[PDB]
From a paper:
Finally, the C-terminal extension comprising residues V114 to K122 (or V125 to A131 in FXR2), which fold back along the base of the tandem Tudor domains toward the N-terminus, engages in extensive interactions with the intervening segment that tethers the individual Tudor domains. The residues defining this pocket (Y95, W97, V66, and E104 for FXR1) are strictly conserved amongst the Fragile X paralogues.
FMRP, Fragile X Mental Retardation Protein, and its autosomal paralogues, FXR1 and FXR2 (Fragile X mental Retardation Syndrome-related Protein 1 and 2, respectively), comprise a family of RNA-binding proteins. The N-terminal region of FMRP, and the FXR1 and FXR2 paralogues, contains a nuclear localization signal between residues 1 and 184.
Residue numbers in the entry: 3 to 52, 59 to 69, 75 to 95, 102 to 121
The structure:
């Protein structure tokens, strides 16, 4: 089961739940950078289900989701802020509204 985990950097890394505990879960990450870990539930959420000025998330770097504002859009391009960077549609999304686990 797929999940997103808050890194110590406040960004969210994709993963899945390999095991459940009384007070932890065991996540493996969908990346070779990070190993299996027991995690507190308040650090874990579900991934989300299926415009300028917007508050969005963005895919960056091990890569994961950071909170960003679209400063300006032109052509294929979005100027975003977190630092500042020019990205394309595929690296962006509205904020994952999901809450962490209870």
């Amino acid at each position: 089961l797929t999940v997103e985990v808050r890194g110590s950097n406040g960004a969210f890394y994709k993963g899945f739940i390999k095991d459940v505990h009384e007070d932890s879960l065991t996540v493996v990450f969908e990346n070779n950078w990070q190993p299996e870990r027991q995690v507190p539930f308040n650090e874990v959420r579900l991934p989300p289900p299926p415009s300028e000025g917007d508050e969005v998330e963005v895919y960056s770097r091990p890569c994961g989701w950071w909170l960003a504002k679209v400063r300006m859009m032109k052509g294929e391009f979005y100027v975003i802020e977190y630092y500042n960077e020019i990205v394309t549609f595929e690296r962006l999304r509205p904020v994952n509204q999901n809450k962490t686990v209870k």
